[PDB]
Amino acid sequence: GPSFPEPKVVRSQGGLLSLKLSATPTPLAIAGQRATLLTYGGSFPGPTLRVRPRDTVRLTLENRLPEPTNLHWHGLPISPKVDDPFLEIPPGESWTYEFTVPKELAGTFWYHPHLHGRVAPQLFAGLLGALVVESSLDAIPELREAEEHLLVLKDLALQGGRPAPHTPMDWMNGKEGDLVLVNGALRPTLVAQKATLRLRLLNASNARYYRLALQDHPLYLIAADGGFLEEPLEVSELLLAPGERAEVLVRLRKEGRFLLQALPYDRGAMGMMDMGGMAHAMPQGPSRPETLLYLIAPKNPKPLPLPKALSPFPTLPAPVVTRRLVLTEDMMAARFFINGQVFDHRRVDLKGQAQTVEVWEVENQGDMDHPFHLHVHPFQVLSVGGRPFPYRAWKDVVNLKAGEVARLLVPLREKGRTVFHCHIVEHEDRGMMGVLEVG
């Protein structure tokens, strides 16, 4: 096959993407060993769905797992009556998700389970895939002539040829695995044929962070979770928290081999020690550095010029309300709270009005990083930790370090009941989720 493994793509045909997926335990070869994973479509990652605005998606999910499951269309501003976080598909049953892709949309999205209390083991076991909304902007020459690749960043740990079970400490920290994979492959080689790459990046890990840096190169950020930036932004490294996506251009500068690495990053995960008195929680400290892939540049590379502009960011109406959502932890209990409460699917926490704009101030009063996710309603990050964000783009996950406040501008789009939650999915399963109702 290709040097660079990527999930097989399913494209809409004549404006319709009609597909039956099964969620199933699946023997496969991964990272050179046999294992049984839980997969969509028989593969890990699941197939990449590639659509355009105004396409119809008709996805029938057949549940062949021994437990109930459902799908969250992560990042898509569609109705929560379709992207329904409360729906349960029992074992052996099927459900058809049907929606129209919004007109004003572009970027990399993804799909995964969202059945409260079961997300973390289902996602860890292999249930996830990408969705790409292709744009008329992809025809500008500076993007069309780039070599495009999707990188699904997701780690795994195997025990007995199956995903390793969750321990108590995994429920507290979020589970990370020792196999740090790209598109299900261990440290693949990307032999570039063009001097400009356009990389779609997805962090589909339960809890692992990827502090991305390409040796000897900057990255040019051109899209965040839910859409393009207004113009490319040069960065020396890019932190992708669980659930985040980004698209970057890479402008290869000379022949050679360059490592794409996940550089050491301390997200506040905790261990336990006993030193005589004790036992007490102690910080795990930074992650060990990981090589994600080997990038081989072509001979005599001469990258394209960068595009001068991408997409203008919408002018939003003035906001009508300011919310404040405070995140806290009880680590030894592995319990996690928003404004002092755990999730209750019967309780509405916030009630807002469709087509108004809200300011949400999300404050992390814990010691771990928490990546905050809001379904259905993409947002503009104004500032985090008191620092203004350096670009305007739609996001749907924002990472908060310990102590930091994020200020978000949140246009409320579709009516209905939806959720917001930490995207360290163990923390959502353990209570860090609340209910927004839009009317």
Residue ranges for the known binding site are 74, 112, 114, 370, 375, 421-423, 427
Q: Name the amino acid, one letter, at 231.
A: E
Cα-Cα-Cα-Cα torsion 100, 104, 110, 112, nearest 10 degrees, comes to -50
**How many helices (H) and strands (E) would you count in the chain?**
4, 37
340 CA to centre of own chain: 26
Residues 160-219 that bind Cu ion (CB under 5 A): none
CB of 21 to its own copies, least distance (A): 44
Q: Candidates 41-49, 130-138, 259-267, 312-320: pick the segment binding Na ion (CB under 5 A).
A: 41-49
Closest to Cu ion by CB, 134 vs 428, is 428
CB of 151 to its own copies, least distance (A): 24
Near Na ion by CB under 5 A: residue from 25, 42, 68, 102 = 42
Q: How far apart are CA 16 and CA 57, in angstroms?
A: 6
237 binds, options its own copies, Cu ion, Na ion, none, Cβ within 5 to 8 A by partner type:
none
φ/ψ of residue 313, rounded to 5: -80, 135
Q: Total number of residues binding Na ion (CB under 5 A)?
A: 3
CB of 22 to Na ion, least distance (A): 4
234 binds, options its own copies, Na ion, Cu ion, none, Cβ within 5 to 8 A by partner type:
its own copies
22 binds, options its own copies, Na ion, Cu ion, none, Cβ within 5 to 8 A by partner type:
Na ion
96 CA to centre of own chain: 23
Residues 298-357 that bind Cu ion (CB under 5 A): none
Q: Candidates 17-25, 174-182, 207-215, 427-435: pick the segment binding Na ion (CB under 5 A).
A: 17-25
229 binds, options Na ion, its own copies, Cu ion, none, Cβ within 5 to 8 A by partner type:
none
Question: What burial class does residue 375 get, using C-beta atoms within 10 Å of its C-beta: 0-12 exposed, 13-18 middle, 19+ buried?
Answer: buried
Secondary structure (DSSP) of 103-130: SS--EEEEEE---TTSHHHHHHHT--EE
CB of 362 to its own copies, least distance (A): 28
CB of 253 to its own copies, least distance (A): 8
427 touches Cu ion by CB under 5 A: yes
24 binds, options Na ion, its own copies, Cu ion, none, Cβ within 5 to 8 A by partner type:
Na ion
Near Cu ion by CB under 5 A: residue from 118, 245, 267, 370 = 370
Take residue 44 and report the two structure tokens written for it: 């890990």
Tell me 287's DSSP state: P
Near Na ion by CB under 5 A: residue from 5, 18, 19, 22 = 22
422 touches Cu ion by CB under 5 A: yes
Binding site for Cu(2+), by residue number, is 74, 112, 114, 370, 375, 421-423, 427
Take residue 313 and report the two structure tokens written for it: 């960011």
Pairing of strands 196-203, 245-251: antiparallel
Q: Candidates 19-27, 74-82, 92-100, 389-397: pick the segment binding Na ion (CB under 5 A).
A: 19-27
Secondary structure (DSSP) of 404-437: -EEEEEEE--S-EEEEEEESSHHHHHTT-EEEEE
Q: How far apart are CA 94 and CA 46, in angstroms?
A: 17
Q: Which residues pair with 89 in a beta bridge?
A: 69
374 CA to centre of own chain: 12
φ/ψ of residue 125, rounded to 5: -80, -10
Closest to Cu ion by CB, 370 vs 417, is 370
Q: Which of 243, 438, 423 has its CA nearest to residue 349?
A: 438
Based on C-alpha coordinates, what's the Rg of the chain?
21
Q: Candidates 70-78, 258-266, 277-285, 306-314: pick the segment binding Cu ion (CB under 5 A).
A: 70-78
427 binds, options Cu ion, Na ion, its own copies, none, Cβ within 5 to 8 A by partner type:
Cu ion
φ/ψ of residue 429, rounded to 5: -60, -30
60 touches Na ion by CB under 5 A: no
Secondary structure (DSSP) of 296-328: EE-SS--PPPPPS---PPPPPPPPSEEEEEEEE
Q: Candidates 112-120, 127-135, 315-323, 384-392: pick the segment binding Cu ion (CB under 5 A).
A: 112-120
Residues 284-343 that bind Na ion (CB under 5 A): none
Closest to its own copies by CB, 93 vs 234, is 234
Closest to Cu ion by CB, 50 vs 116, is 116
Catalog residues that contact Cu ion under the rule CB under 5 A: 74, 114, 243, 370, 422, 424, 427
Catalog residues that contact Na ion under the rule CB under 5 A: 22, 24, 42
